[PDB]
């Protein structure tokens, strides 16, 4: 899960 | 290293290649275009194509992650089944997933480290990690 949310911050940042 | 990276990938025929601590350089080579890649990320800024451009701030220290880990142990990290891969060391794990990446190869050079990636099963073949540097 500490997976996912790497990709949800940068994503959410662009 | 633009030039350099792009005669890279091109010739071995990986879809895409990014030396490396922040960024350096990328260029894409699967099925204008990395150009195409570093103008909307920087604009941006405040399904392959989507993995090489997310990278952009993926970013660790000495030992984290896939170049990390090659800078500070001095190897290259061949990589399989990466759409199945655990995040302990391959740190972009669910973002190798979403475009169906089999293989991933990290290795320091030239001061940094380079990274190549591509979407099928290559056996651990090292004498293409001589062929970046002799074709460079």
């Not at chain 2, 759409?83 to 293989?103: G, I, N």
Request: with cysteine; hydrophobic share 40%.
């Amino acid at each position: 899960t500490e997976q996912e949310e790497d990709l949800i911050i940068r994503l959410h940042k662009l | 290293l633009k030039k350099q990276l792009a005669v890279s990938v091109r010739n071995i025929q990986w879809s895409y290649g990014i030396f490396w601590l922040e960024w350096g350089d990328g260029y894409y080579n699967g099925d204008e275009r990395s150009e195409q890649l570093r103008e909307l990320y920087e604009s941006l800024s405040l399904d392959t194509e989507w993995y090489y451009l997310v990278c952009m701030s993926f970013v660790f220290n000495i030992g984290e992650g896939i170049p990390g880990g090659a800078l500070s142990n001095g190897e290259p990290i061949w990589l399989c089944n990466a759409e199945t891969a655990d995040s302990k060391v391959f740190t972009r794990s669910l973002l190798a997933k979403s475009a169906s990446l089999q293989t991933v190869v990290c290795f320091p050079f030239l001061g940094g480290v380079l990274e190549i990636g591509t979407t099928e099963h290559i056996k651990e073949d090292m004498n293409v990690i001589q062929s970046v540097k002799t074709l460079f």
